[PDB]
JSON list of C-alpha atoms in Angstrom, two decimals:
[
{"chain": "Z", "resi": 1, "resn": "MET", "atom": "CA", "xyz": [-6.12, 9.25, -6.13]},
{"chain": "Z", "resi": 2, "resn": "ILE", "atom": "CA", "xyz": [-2.34, 9.10, -5.14]},
{"chain": "Z", "resi": 3, "resn": "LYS", "atom": "CA", "xyz": [-0.40, 11.82, -7.02]},
{"chain": "Z", "resi": 4, "resn": "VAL", "atom": "CA", "xyz": [3.07, 10.57, -8.15]},
{"chain": "Z", "resi": 5, "resn": "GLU", "atom": "CA", "xyz": [5.68, 12.65, -10.00]},
{"chain": "Z", "resi": 6, "resn": "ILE", "atom": "CA", "xyz": [8.82, 11.85, -11.86]},
{"chain": "Z", "resi": 7, "resn": "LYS", "atom": "CA", "xyz": [10.87, 15.16, -11.90]},
{"chain": "Z", "resi": 8, "resn": "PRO", "atom": "CA", "xyz": [13.34, 15.82, -14.89]},
{"chain": "Z", "resi": 9, "resn": "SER", "atom": "CA", "xyz": [16.19, 14.88, -12.46]},
{"chain": "Z", "resi": 10, "resn": "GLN", "atom": "CA", "xyz": [14.58, 11.49, -11.78]},
{"chain": "Z", "resi": 11, "resn": "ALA", "atom": "CA", "xyz": [14.42, 10.18, -15.37]},
{"chain": "Z", "resi": 12, "resn": "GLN", "atom": "CA", "xyz": [17.16, 7.57, -14.98]},
{"chain": "Z", "resi": 13, "resn": "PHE", "atom": "CA", "xyz": [17.53, 4.43, -12.97]},
{"chain": "Z", "resi": 14, "resn": "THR", "atom": "CA", "xyz": [20.26, 2.61, -11.22]},
{"chain": "Z", "resi": 15, "resn": "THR", "atom": "CA", "xyz": [20.86, -1.10, -11.10]},
{"chain": "Z", "resi": 16, "resn": "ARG", "atom": "CA", "xyz": [21.73, -3.24, -8.19]},
{"chain": "Z", "resi": 17, "resn": "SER", "atom": "CA", "xyz": [23.12, -6.64, -8.80]},
{"chain": "Z", "resi": 18, "resn": "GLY", "atom": "CA", "xyz": [23.77, -9.99, -7.15]},
{"chain": "Z", "resi": 19, "resn": "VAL", "atom": "CA", "xyz": [23.08, -13.75, -6.69]},
{"chain": "Z", "resi": 20, "resn": "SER", "atom": "CA", "xyz": [20.15, -15.64, -5.04]},
{"chain": "Z", "resi": 21, "resn": "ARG", "atom": "CA", "xyz": [20.92, -18.02, -2.10]},
{"chain": "Z", "resi": 22, "resn": "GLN", "atom": "CA", "xyz": [20.39, -20.87, -4.52]},
{"chain": "Z", "resi": 23, "resn": "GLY", "atom": "CA", "xyz": [23.02, -19.58, -7.09]},
{"chain": "Z", "resi": 24, "resn": "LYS", "atom": "CA", "xyz": [20.73, -17.58, -9.59]},
{"chain": "Z", "resi": 25, "resn": "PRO", "atom": "CA", "xyz": [21.97, -14.00, -10.41]},
{"chain": "Z", "resi": 26, "resn": "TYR", "atom": "CA", "xyz": [19.54, -11.07, -10.21]},
{"chain": "Z", "resi": 27, "resn": "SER", "atom": "CA", "xyz": [19.26, -7.42, -11.12]},
{"chain": "Z", "resi": 28, "resn": "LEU", "atom": "CA", "xyz": [17.03, -4.74, -9.64]},
{"chain": "Z", "resi": 29, "resn": "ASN", "atom": "CA", "xyz": [16.38, -1.42, -11.41]},
{"chain": "Z", "resi": 30, "resn": "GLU", "atom": "CA", "xyz": [15.27, 1.41, -9.20]},
{"chain": "Z", "resi": 31, "resn": "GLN", "atom": "CA", "xyz": [14.08, 4.93, -9.77]},
{"chain": "Z", "resi": 32, "resn": "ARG", "atom": "CA", "xyz": [13.00, 7.86, -7.51]},
{"chain": "Z", "resi": 33, "resn": "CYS", "atom": "CA", "xyz": [9.84, 9.92, -7.53]},
{"chain": "Z", "resi": 34, "resn": "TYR", "atom": "CA", "xyz": [7.80, 12.17, -5.45]},
{"chain": "Z", "resi": 35, "resn": "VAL", "atom": "CA", "xyz": [4.62, 11.09, -3.86]},
{"chain": "Z", "resi": 36, "resn": "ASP", "atom": "CA", "xyz": [2.10, 13.48, -2.59]},
{"chain": "Z", "resi": 37, "resn": "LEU", "atom": "CA", "xyz": [1.03, 12.23, 0.80]},
{"chain": "Z", "resi": 38, "resn": "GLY", "atom": "CA", "xyz": [-0.84, 15.40, 1.60]},
{"chain": "Z", "resi": 39, "resn": "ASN", "atom": "CA", "xyz": [2.00, 16.85, 3.71]},
{"chain": "Z", "resi": 40, "resn": "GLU", "atom": "CA", "xyz": [3.56, 20.47, 3.26]},
{"chain": "Z", "resi": 41, "resn": "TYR", "atom": "CA", "xyz": [5.53, 19.10, 0.28]},
{"chain": "Z", "resi": 42, "resn": "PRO", "atom": "CA", "xyz": [5.65, 15.71, -1.55]},
{"chain": "Z", "resi": 43, "resn": "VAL", "atom": "CA", "xyz": [7.91, 12.99, -0.15]},
{"chain": "Z", "resi": 44, "resn": "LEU", "atom": "CA", "xyz": [10.69, 11.16, -1.87]},
{"chain": "Z", "resi": 45, "resn": "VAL", "atom": "CA", "xyz": [10.14, 7.47, -2.70]},
{"chain": "Z", "resi": 46, "resn": "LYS", "atom": "CA", "xyz": [12.24, 4.68, -4.18]},
{"chain": "Z", "resi": 47, "resn": "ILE", "atom": "CA", "xyz": [10.39, 2.38, -6.65]},
{"chain": "Z", "resi": 48, "resn": "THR", "atom": "CA", "xyz": [11.77, -1.00, -8.08]},
{"chain": "Z", "resi": 49, "resn": "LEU", "atom": "CA", "xyz": [10.87, -1.47, -11.69]},
{"chain": "Z", "resi": 50, "resn": "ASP", "atom": "CA", "xyz": [9.73, -4.84, -12.99]},
{"chain": "Z", "resi": 51, "resn": "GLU", "atom": "CA", "xyz": [12.12, -6.94, -15.19]},
{"chain": "Z", "resi": 52, "resn": "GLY", "atom": "CA", "xyz": [12.23, -5.51, -18.79]},
{"chain": "Z", "resi": 53, "resn": "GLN", "atom": "CA", "xyz": [10.80, -2.15, -17.65]},
{"chain": "Z", "resi": 54, "resn": "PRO", "atom": "CA", "xyz": [12.37, 1.17, -18.79]},
{"chain": "Z", "resi": 55, "resn": "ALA", "atom": "CA", "xyz": [12.53, 4.02, -16.34]},
{"chain": "Z", "resi": 56, "resn": "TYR", "atom": "CA", "xyz": [9.39, 6.14, -16.16]},
{"chain": "Z", "resi": 57, "resn": "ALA", "atom": "CA", "xyz": [9.74, 9.39, -18.15]},
{"chain": "Z", "resi": 58, "resn": "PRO", "atom": "CA", "xyz": [9.15, 12.77, -16.27]},
{"chain": "Z", "resi": 59, "resn": "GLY", "atom": "CA", "xyz": [5.52, 13.42, -15.64]},
{"chain": "Z", "resi": 60, "resn": "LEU", "atom": "CA", "xyz": [2.46, 12.86, -13.60]},
{"chain": "Z", "resi": 61, "resn": "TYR", "atom": "CA", "xyz": [1.42, 9.40, -12.66]},
{"chain": "Z", "resi": 62, "resn": "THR", "atom": "CA", "xyz": [-1.08, 7.60, -10.53]},
{"chain": "Z", "resi": 63, "resn": "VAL", "atom": "CA", "xyz": [-0.86, 4.13, -8.94]},
{"chain": "Z", "resi": 64, "resn": "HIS", "atom": "CA", "xyz": [-2.03, 1.03, -10.78]},
{"chain": "Z", "resi": 65, "resn": "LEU", "atom": "CA", "xyz": [-4.14, -1.59, -8.88]},
{"chain": "Z", "resi": 66, "resn": "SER", "atom": "CA", "xyz": [-1.56, -4.24, -9.60]},
{"chain": "Z", "resi": 67, "resn": "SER", "atom": "CA", "xyz": [0.67, -2.53, -7.01]},
{"chain": "Z", "resi": 68, "resn": "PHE", "atom": "CA", "xyz": [-1.43, -4.08, -4.26]},
{"chain": "Z", "resi": 69, "resn": "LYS", "atom": "CA", "xyz": [-1.68, -7.61, -2.89]},
{"chain": "Z", "resi": 70, "resn": "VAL", "atom": "CA", "xyz": [-2.97, -9.42, 0.26]},
{"chain": "Z", "resi": 71, "resn": "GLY", "atom": "CA", "xyz": [-0.16, -10.26, 2.62]},
{"chain": "Z", "resi": 72, "resn": "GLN", "atom": "CA", "xyz": [0.45, -13.27, 4.75]},
{"chain": "Z", "resi": 73, "resn": "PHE", "atom": "CA", "xyz": [-1.42, -11.85, 7.84]},
{"chain": "Z", "resi": 74, "resn": "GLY", "atom": "CA", "xyz": [-4.51, -11.16, 5.69]},
{"chain": "Z", "resi": 75, "resn": "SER", "atom": "CA", "xyz": [-4.08, -7.35, 5.35]},
{"chain": "Z", "resi": 76, "resn": "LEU", "atom": "CA", "xyz": [-3.57, -5.33, 2.11]},
{"chain": "Z", "resi": 77, "resn": "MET", "atom": "CA", "xyz": [0.04, -4.55, 1.34]},
{"chain": "Z", "resi": 78, "resn": "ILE", "atom": "CA", "xyz": [2.03, -2.90, -1.56]},
{"chain": "Z", "resi": 79, "resn": "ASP", "atom": "CA", "xyz": [3.87, -5.30, -3.72]},
{"chain": "Z", "resi": 80, "resn": "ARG", "atom": "CA", "xyz": [5.73, -2.94, -6.02]},
{"chain": "Z", "resi": 81, "resn": "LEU", "atom": "CA", "xyz": [4.53, 0.60, -6.81]},
{"chain": "Z", "resi": 82, "resn": "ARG", "atom": "CA", "xyz": [3.44, 0.32, -10.47]},
{"chain": "Z", "resi": 83, "resn": "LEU", "atom": "CA", "xyz": [2.46, 3.50, -12.29]},
{"chain": "Z", "resi": 84, "resn": "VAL", "atom": "CA", "xyz": [0.27, 4.74, -15.05]},
{"chain": "Z", "resi": 85, "resn": "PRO", "atom": "CA", "xyz": [-0.04, 8.17, -16.84]},
{"chain": "Z", "resi": 86, "resn": "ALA", "atom": "CA", "xyz": [-2.33, 10.53, -15.01]},
{"chain": "E", "resi": 1, "resn": "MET", "atom": "CA", "xyz": [-9.36, 4.17, -7.45]},
{"chain": "E", "resi": 2, "resn": "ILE", "atom": "CA", "xyz": [-9.35, 1.04, -5.12]},
{"chain": "E", "resi": 3, "resn": "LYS", "atom": "CA", "xyz": [-12.93, -0.25, -4.68]},
{"chain": "E", "resi": 4, "resn": "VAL", "atom": "CA", "xyz": [-13.57, -1.46, -1.07]},
{"chain": "E", "resi": 5, "resn": "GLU", "atom": "CA", "xyz": [-16.84, -2.97, 0.21]},
{"chain": "E", "resi": 6, "resn": "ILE", "atom": "CA", "xyz": [-18.23, -3.69, 3.60]},
{"chain": "E", "resi": 7, "resn": "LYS", "atom": "CA", "xyz": [-20.96, -6.41, 3.05]},
{"chain": "E", "resi": 8, "resn": "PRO", "atom": "CA", "xyz": [-24.00, -6.57, 5.53]},
{"chain": "E", "resi": 9, "resn": "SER", "atom": "CA", "xyz": [-22.26, -9.61, 7.14]},
{"chain": "E", "resi": 10, "resn": "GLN", "atom": "CA", "xyz": [-19.12, -7.55, 7.79]},
{"chain": "E", "resi": 11, "resn": "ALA", "atom": "CA", "xyz": [-20.68, -4.74, 9.87]},
{"chain": "E", "resi": 12, "resn": "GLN", "atom": "CA", "xyz": [-19.19, -5.81, 13.20]},
{"chain": "E", "resi": 13, "resn": "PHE", "atom": "CA", "xyz": [-15.71, -6.02, 14.58]},
{"chain": "E", "resi": 14, "resn": "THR", "atom": "CA", "xyz": [-13.81, -8.22, 16.89]},
{"chain": "E", "resi": 15, "resn": "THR", "atom": "CA", "xyz": [-11.29, -7.20, 19.50]},
{"chain": "E", "resi": 16, "resn": "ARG", "atom": "CA", "xyz": [-7.98, -8.69, 20.27]},
{"chain": "E", "resi": 17, "resn": "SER", "atom": "CA", "xyz": [-6.35, -7.91, 23.52]},
{"chain": "E", "resi": 18, "resn": "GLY", "atom": "CA", "xyz": [-3.03, -8.00, 25.35]},
{"chain": "E", "resi": 19, "resn": "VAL", "atom": "CA", "xyz": [0.01, -6.29, 26.96]},
{"chain": "E", "resi": 20, "resn": "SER", "atom": "CA", "xyz": [3.07, -4.50, 25.42]},
{"chain": "E", "resi": 21, "resn": "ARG", "atom": "CA", "xyz": [6.60, -5.84, 26.25]},
{"chain": "E", "resi": 22, "resn": "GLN", "atom": "CA", "xyz": [6.99, -2.87, 28.54]},
{"chain": "E", "resi": 23, "resn": "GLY", "atom": "CA", "xyz": [3.76, -3.66, 30.60]},
{"chain": "E", "resi": 24, "resn": "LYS", "atom": "CA", "xyz": [1.12, -1.37, 28.77]},
{"chain": "E", "resi": 25, "resn": "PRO", "atom": "CA", "xyz": [-2.17, -3.18, 27.79]},
{"chain": "E", "resi": 26, "resn": "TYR", "atom": "CA", "xyz": [-3.54, -2.81, 24.25]},
{"chain": "E", "resi": 27, "resn": "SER", "atom": "CA", "xyz": [-6.63, -3.54, 22.21]},
{"chain": "E", "resi": 28, "resn": "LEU", "atom": "CA", "xyz": [-6.98, -3.98, 18.46]},
{"chain": "E", "resi": 29, "resn": "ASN", "atom": "CA", "xyz": [-10.36, -3.80, 16.70]},
{"chain": "E", "resi": 30, "resn": "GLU", "atom": "CA", "xyz": [-10.53, -5.51, 13.36]},
{"chain": "E", "resi": 31, "resn": "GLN", "atom": "CA", "xyz": [-13.10, -5.77, 10.62]},
{"chain": "E", "resi": 32, "resn": "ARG", "atom": "CA", "xyz": [-13.32, -7.58, 7.22]},
{"chain": "E", "resi": 33, "resn": "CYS", "atom": "CA", "xyz": [-14.10, -6.22, 3.79]},
{"chain": "E", "resi": 34, "resn": "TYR", "atom": "CA", "xyz": [-13.78, -6.99, 0.20]},
{"chain": "E", "resi": 35, "resn": "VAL", "atom": "CA", "xyz": [-11.27, -5.32, -1.97]},
{"chain": "E", "resi": 36, "resn": "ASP", "atom": "CA", "xyz": [-11.51, -5.31, -5.67]},
{"chain": "E", "resi": 37, "resn": "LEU", "atom": "CA", "xyz": [-8.07, -6.13, -6.98]},
{"chain": "E", "resi": 38, "resn": "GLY", "atom": "CA", "xyz": [-9.30, -6.60, -10.50]},
{"chain": "E", "resi": 39, "resn": "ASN", "atom": "CA", "xyz": [-9.42, -10.42, -10.22]},
{"chain": "E", "resi": 40, "resn": "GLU", "atom": "CA", "xyz": [-12.54, -12.67, -11.15]},
{"chain": "E", "resi": 41, "resn": "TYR", "atom": "CA", "xyz": [-14.09, -11.68, -7.79]},
{"chain": "E", "resi": 42, "resn": "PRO", "atom": "CA", "xyz": [-13.06, -9.29, -4.95]},
{"chain": "E", "resi": 43, "resn": "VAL", "atom": "CA", "xyz": [-10.68, -10.59, -2.28]},
{"chain": "E", "resi": 44, "resn": "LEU", "atom": "CA", "xyz": [-11.19, -10.72, 1.43]},
{"chain": "E", "resi": 45, "resn": "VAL", "atom": "CA", "xyz": [-9.12, -8.35, 3.59]},
{"chain": "E", "resi": 46, "resn": "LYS", "atom": "CA", "xyz": [-8.66, -7.78, 7.32]},
{"chain": "E", "resi": 47, "resn": "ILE", "atom": "CA", "xyz": [-8.41, -4.09, 8.38]},
{"chain": "E", "resi": 48, "resn": "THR", "atom": "CA", "xyz": [-7.38, -2.81, 11.93]},
{"chain": "E", "resi": 49, "resn": "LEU", "atom": "CA", "xyz": [-9.37, 0.17, 13.00]},
{"chain": "E", "resi": 50, "resn": "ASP", "atom": "CA", "xyz": [-7.72, 3.10, 14.75]},
{"chain": "E", "resi": 51, "resn": "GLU", "atom": "CA", "xyz": [-8.31, 3.63, 18.53]},
{"chain": "E", "resi": 52, "resn": "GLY", "atom": "CA", "xyz": [-11.82, 5.16, 19.15]},
{"chain": "E", "resi": 53, "resn": "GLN", "atom": "CA", "xyz": [-13.04, 4.10, 15.68]},
{"chain": "E", "resi": 54, "resn": "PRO", "atom": "CA", "xyz": [-16.44, 2.36, 15.22]},
{"chain": "E", "resi": 55, "resn": "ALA", "atom": "CA", "xyz": [-16.73, -0.37, 12.66]},
{"chain": "E", "resi": 56, "resn": "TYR", "atom": "CA", "xyz": [-17.41, 0.82, 9.12]},
{"chain": "E", "resi": 57, "resn": "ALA", "atom": "CA", "xyz": [-21.10, 0.47, 8.18]},
{"chain": "E", "resi": 58, "resn": "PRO", "atom": "CA", "xyz": [-22.00, -1.62, 4.99]},
{"chain": "E", "resi": 59, "resn": "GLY", "atom": "CA", "xyz": [-21.26, 0.23, 1.83]},
{"chain": "E", "resi": 60, "resn": "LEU", "atom": "CA", "xyz": [-18.82, 1.33, -0.76]},
{"chain": "E", "resi": 61, "resn": "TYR", "atom": "CA", "xyz": [-15.57, 2.87, 0.24]},
{"chain": "E", "resi": 62, "resn": "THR", "atom": "CA", "xyz": [-12.33, 4.03, -1.24]},
{"chain": "E", "resi": 63, "resn": "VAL", "atom": "CA", "xyz": [-8.88, 4.32, 0.39]},
{"chain": "E", "resi": 64, "resn": "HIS", "atom": "CA", "xyz": [-7.79, 7.49, 2.17]},
{"chain": "E", "resi": 65, "resn": "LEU", "atom": "CA", "xyz": [-4.23, 8.85, 1.54]},
{"chain": "E", "resi": 66, "resn": "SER", "atom": "CA", "xyz": [-3.44, 8.58, 5.21]},
{"chain": "E", "resi": 67, "resn": "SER", "atom": "CA", "xyz": [-3.28, 4.79, 4.72]},
{"chain": "E", "resi": 68, "resn": "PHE", "atom": "CA", "xyz": [0.14, 5.20, 3.13]},
{"chain": "E", "resi": 69, "resn": "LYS", "atom": "CA", "xyz": [3.57, 5.97, 4.55]},
{"chain": "E", "resi": 70, "resn": "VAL", "atom": "CA", "xyz": [7.28, 5.68, 3.52]},
{"chain": "E", "resi": 71, "resn": "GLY", "atom": "CA", "xyz": [8.91, 2.67, 5.06]},
{"chain": "E", "resi": 72, "resn": "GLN", "atom": "CA", "xyz": [12.34, 2.17, 6.47]},
{"chain": "E", "resi": 73, "resn": "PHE", "atom": "CA", "xyz": [13.90, 1.02, 3.11]},
{"chain": "E", "resi": 74, "resn": "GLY", "atom": "CA", "xyz": [12.57, 4.17, 1.38]},
{"chain": "E", "resi": 75, "resn": "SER", "atom": "CA", "xyz": [9.62, 2.54, -0.48]},
{"chain": "E", "resi": 76, "resn": "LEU", "atom": "CA", "xyz": [5.88, 3.33, -0.09]},
{"chain": "E", "resi": 77, "resn": "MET", "atom": "CA", "xyz": [4.06, 1.00, 2.26]},
{"chain": "E", "resi": 78, "resn": "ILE", "atom": "CA", "xyz": [0.49, 0.71, 3.77]},
{"chain": "E", "resi": 79, "resn": "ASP", "atom": "CA", "xyz": [0.25, 1.72, 7.34]},
{"chain": "E", "resi": 80, "resn": "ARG", "atom": "CA", "xyz": [-3.36, 0.88, 8.11]},
{"chain": "E", "resi": 81, "resn": "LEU", "atom": "CA", "xyz": [-6.09, 0.75, 5.43]},
{"chain": "E", "resi": 82, "resn": "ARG", "atom": "CA", "xyz": [-8.22, 3.83, 6.28]},
{"chain": "E", "resi": 83, "resn": "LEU", "atom": "CA", "xyz": [-11.46, 4.31, 4.38]},
{"chain": "E", "resi": 84, "resn": "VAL", "atom": "CA", "xyz": [-13.78, 6.99, 3.19]},
{"chain": "E", "resi": 85, "resn": "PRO", "atom": "CA", "xyz": [-17.33, 6.90, 1.60]},
{"chain": "E", "resi": 86, "resn": "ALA", "atom": "CA", "xyz": [-17.20, 6.42, -2.13]}
]
């Protein structure tokens, strides 16, 4: 259903760091990918990895159902784009 | 990929109405459905129809790619859940 691609230049992540308002330090890992939204070319997307997750290797992926959740106004939203081998 | 269902009790919509901050009147049509998020049972979801759209008849649906868009922080988000016969 949604075609996602991690290009050989996208095989690494970066880490942002900080502290929660209540004192607790955090760390977000992000990676980039291409998502085919049916336009002339795929678009570029930033995804945040879950804690303990390695970067996704190059390849073809599709979206896992766990990426979705119901939001606070009752509509479906994306939580975190979570991927599985295609 | 995502299983969506319009139950025989969900075959109608409701309309909210109003005026934009700049004077222009609007009207949103919404309908309810069940979305299988892989939990014990499907969850209940509100969807806003696009202008000129009739309510979806009862049945099985899946999500159309046009439901997705890149948001202003670079991540994938849902615009409006837009459905197609399964």
